[PDB]
Amino acid sequence: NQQDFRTPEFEEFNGKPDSLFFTDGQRRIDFILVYEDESGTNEKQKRKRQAYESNLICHGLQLEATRSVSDKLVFVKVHAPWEVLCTYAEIMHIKLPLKSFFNPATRSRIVYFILSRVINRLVSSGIYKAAFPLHDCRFNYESEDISCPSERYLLYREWAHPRSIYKKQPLDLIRKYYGEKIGIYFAWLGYYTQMLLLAAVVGVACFLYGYLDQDNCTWSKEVCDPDIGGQILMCPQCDRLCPFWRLNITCESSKKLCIFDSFGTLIFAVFMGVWVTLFLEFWKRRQAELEYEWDTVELQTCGKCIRVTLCASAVFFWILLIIASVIGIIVYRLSVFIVMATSITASIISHIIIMILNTIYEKVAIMITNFELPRTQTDYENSLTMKMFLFQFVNYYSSCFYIAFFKGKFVGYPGDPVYLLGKYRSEECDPGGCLLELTTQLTIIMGGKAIWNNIQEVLLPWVMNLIGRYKKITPRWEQDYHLQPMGKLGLFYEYLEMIIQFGFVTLFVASFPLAPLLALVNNILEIRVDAWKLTTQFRRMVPEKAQDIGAWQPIMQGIAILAVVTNAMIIAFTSDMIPRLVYYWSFSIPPYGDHTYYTMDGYINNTLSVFNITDENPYIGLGNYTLCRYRDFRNPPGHPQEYKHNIYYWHVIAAKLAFIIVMEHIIYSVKFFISYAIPDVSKITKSKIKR
Template identity: 45%
Template sequence: MSFDWKSEQRFFLKGELQSLSSRETSFLINEETTPAKRFNLFLRRRLMFQKNQQSKDSIFFRDGIRQIDFVLSYADDIKKDAELKAERRKEFEKNLRKTGLELEIEDKRDSEDGRTYFVKIHAPWEVLVTYAEVLGIKMPIKESDIPRPKQTPMSYVLGPVSLPTSVKYPHPEYFTAQFSRHRQELFLIEDQATFFPSSSRNRIVYYILSRCPFGIEDGKKRFGIERLLNSNTYSSAYPLHDGQYWKPSEPPNPTNERYILHQNWARFSYFYKEQPLDLIKNYYGEKIGIYFVFLGFYTEMLSFAAVVGLACFIYGLLSMEDNTSSTEICDPEIGGQMIMCPLCDQVCDYWRLNSTCLASKFSHLFDNESTVFFAIFMGIWVTLFLEFWKQRQARLEYEWDLVDFEEEQQQLQLRPEFEAMCKHRKLNPVTKEMEPYMPLYARIPWYFLSGATVTLWMSLVVTSMVAVIVYRLSVFATLASFMESDASLKQVKSFLTPQITTSLTGSCLNFIVILILNFFYEKISAWITKMEIPRTYQEYESSLTLKMFLFQFVNFYSSCFYVAFFKGKFVGYPGKYTYLFDEWRSEECDPGGCLIELTTQLTIIMTGKQIFGNIKEAIYPLALNWWRRRKARTNSEKLYSRWEQDHDLESFGPLGLFYEYLETVIQFGFVTLFVASFPLAPLLALINNIVEIRVDAWKLTTQYRRTVASKAHSIGVWQDILYGMAVLSVATNAFIVAFTSDIIPRLVYYYAYSTNATQPMKGYVNNSLSVFLIADFPNHTAPSEKRDFITCRYRDYRYPPDDENKYFHNMQFWHVLAAKMTFIIVMEHVVFLVKFLLAWMIPDVPKDVVERIKREKLMTIKILHDFELNKLKENLGINSNEFAKHVMIEENKAQLAKSTI
């Protein structure tokens, strides 16, 4: 079989291939050696299997020997461009054969739906070894002598969560080197059919598909399977699953890794088990593998935060009855005698403080002394999480041969849409080739459109939040007019006060609005990103990440920021309230503060998002696959082959992993940004992630086509986003404790204003409420019904009406404000100092990993050196003694030259 290197340059991208060295140039078959001739020669040695004798689970060509590495599908098209598409397919498949790939086409009459053609692709050994060298794929050269990490002393405790060793470590560890077809004897090749794993095979085939030309149109060379998919020339392109997920494969099919993954990973009954990470990486590739490593590591770290948060909640629960503030509020002789000023104008009546008894007790669950401790703890926890993740990532790079990782070339490949829109070409200074180029002036209008769209949608989020605030104000006034009649002045202890009822309904409405806006923005953000015409897939994903994260950050967190930092802070005081749009009075907090409302808001949005997300992820692909199968069963007597079964599954898509990361990062924000108000947030996130891992595993294994394997050595831009949110979380939690919680005013009273030595907190409620003279109410704000009392109380620190500085802030207000600012400064500096110390003390790469990397590099160099010396010895044809003398002479010459220098 001969090679024609010029034909390869003729049929592949000129600029792409000319940048490759001679060793990277792909293997091609002469045009004279047609596929038919090669197939006939093959049949002389192999038995040809008939279609009706073929198993529906077979992943081989009809001969039962050549494995299917990739599948393309298309259906008859009766539209006007049908001939053009047929010509493109013909040219594309012709060029694929010229690269050395072998194709087998299944006629539509043999398909179950009766209208779909399937093009099965097999990469022979010569193609695999050529492109393994081009892609720099590392393959084993010797079994590693570095022992795996030893079991910890607590391993017997973790026994129930461990997987069998054969599943956890499906293959031995090897010393590896970049594959070279000229050094094939160096590598551990026992069987050519199984030497390259299926993930590497489909990655190689996709590399060829993405660069194979299919013609010249409008004077430009057109190439790549992505362009053909975008134009509907082909309907799908995917690698095959290696078998059914509910049963193991039978010979001659290889080991069914899909079945092993389903049995040990994708079952919900295994929620407590560790993940078979090496098997996930081998089957789906490093990019998907590292997502599950990150999700699993994040879930493990959440378990520590969940335990501490649960302990803080239990502390609040046990100390609820001993809380002096809620005791005074509930006491008929104290809270029952305090008449509070109306919470809205005219329609709202006066009310007694003890009507919020149950709400004040519930508030103590999350607003107690442990709040400060937990806020500081989470600031340290997030630092430990990110630093230990660096170490986990470094260990993963070593274990998965990603130490010398280079960015995937398909990520750096030009997008077909970019080439289609480009009317200019520019000389690439590296390749010295003319490449598509879009000048800045052509991009500026699209950038303006993109920026305006993002700004518009963020404005919609703010507008919807204001609309929800208006709803809350209106509903509160309505409820108050019904619920706060004369009964409000009696000894009422109801939990469903107008404030709580309005807060619950408003939070639920806000969550529904968030989901609606999020649904539409996902579509719009993808559209405007395409309109920006990014040059590469990497640029496209980065641009989309920025838009989606900014929007979801504002969408999910804006209402929490409002409750935490704005609600109740600019209310004014009776007789001089502030108004929204000159019509609605600004919302006030509960006498115990706004923390309980922030907790309610956070719980509803976080829990609702997690439940909705898991249900959507499980039901959406299941329903689509059921409907697709139902429509496809038109020729059920036909063989429902392996490629047809996978064709009817949902496609994971190039952005499938993007949305998984986005969901996790948004949850990370809930856990860190507002955790001081809700210590149970880590526990809820932990429960969700345990379910999330199994849902993602189940849908990938059973409901989605197999993805093309691709490499990645980190979680990419998401790591920078996590660092930014970690820094922001320190500030938000400090402000929540200072301004949203009631802990600082209580401490100021305890140390500076309490006059009771035995019960220092006695009298705090009375101290925290100011007095207002009812006669000072303007006519348009006072309740319509006259009362026989002359004063009412409101939450603030102001002088009483009989003081010369009446209604001005008193000295205690400034003391409390100074204490709040001092707490923020001290907490931020303490947490940041600990963060920097931990970051300095914890190395990014563990010491044992550094030693393992050095050991592997040394052994790899030694093995390559010995291999080259033995090869040189064979070429020289001399005996061992002469060869040793020859080597010694050369080494002496080198040492002499070194000493002379």
């Protein structure tokens, strides 16, 4: 309880490079302590460190210290004797198998439990420079010690090196080396990859179905036809900045659309609702099986309500402010890049700004909790998880929800457009369409940002380690000291990235079916990059235990429900499928159309709405034209209700709302049945539980 004496056996030896034991070699190293003290704060830190070391020795730990060969830094070796291990294995409910004994992971967990009971406070307040366990050896080389297993080398060879990309994950080795959280993260990632392979082959089937009929989609042929889709002259998209345009750029746009907008995409969206349900249910079953195999189950006012309400209101205000900022920044970045290839540059500029404001968002997300922190790890972690996920959701998915549900959805007919305010003429979608723009944005996100994110993940920790080493034989503790410490909530970031990808896959799956395939390739690379940067660059973290992914499971459930709603809204409002269907059924018939049987020909001409120049009148300056046609269902000019919504408009909007209702109800019913018909715990797992 007092700084009676210092760390015993203060001896220096760095000759053995890959020795995890002490100088005698009898006992291994379950933790390492780092401090620099030789150069009024200095004496206070010295006294407090001496007190802490004395407490550690008195509790039963053995501390042996050495100084860095490359001086002023002193490394202290921490080991738990046999008695300490036995007594804290009796205290901490550890599921030992009863028919050296403990793998180094659980030993380091025990010693960190001891440090917490008597550790992060010293490190945070500059007292201790670092404190960590040790790796077995260098990732690329076998350990010099024959006795010590070089399982880090094995994990680098068969699991982390890109050359073994196609091999199955040794999901038992990574959990026995790193811990249950890392192991369950990688198991969840692998299962997610398998389900993505299933959804990806189904989506490729749908894509090929839409590609084989690409030569028969009548509307796309008419758009490409110069005799039908060339005669149609459209109205300018913006004010005084766009000219009158025909419908022949929409030739290529609509070929790609007919590929990406057909019955195959709707079939795939229904299948994807089913597939999300199956993914969630079978992950519940796999999670139960992993819980059994790994034994993850272990155990160890008015003013306050007013403050909670005020903080929630402040968080909501901040979220709304960031929503507006993201929408404005993407609109103004598009405007900047106006004066394709430009999309990629705009995408990377938005990515850099998003990462800057993401760092800002992390800072504000810890600040908001700073004055309301219960300091209990589980609830604080879950609250921070929810808040950070809300922020990331806001950013990433607002950039896409603006295109899907807000862009072009609230404008008017060319005569008297919807003028917002002093700066007005709110942008409408591209000539290709809102759906094609959303598809291109999702493709850019998936492909380009997955590639660049994996490259950054590979390089940034490696770059930091390289620059740290830039500024001869070194022991294990010194080598581990020159490694990036994976800070607080590091695995949280990996889970967050994968949940963002899952939201991208499921929420907007009705736009392009290749999202599961693009996520499949990304995940196949992601397993290896996350394994490699954890194995080689980042310093080894103390193992712990987790029985599930955490708040990410409720987050995924909410994303699934929101995905049903969002896919219904995408097929109804963003997509053009329902107007085509309504024409083919109830407007190519004698009461409205002229065709005898239900067909699709003469659809583009009949859908578009005329607008003659009877309206400043900025349109006459653009050209000598007199009538332009726009993507709306108003009455023709000269009608008694001209520019007002006509019978066709309300028919189509009723069909859209009816489709939303029918699809949502049927999909929710099927999801309810599948979740009901699937036992969340497998029969084999029940049988082995009975034993």
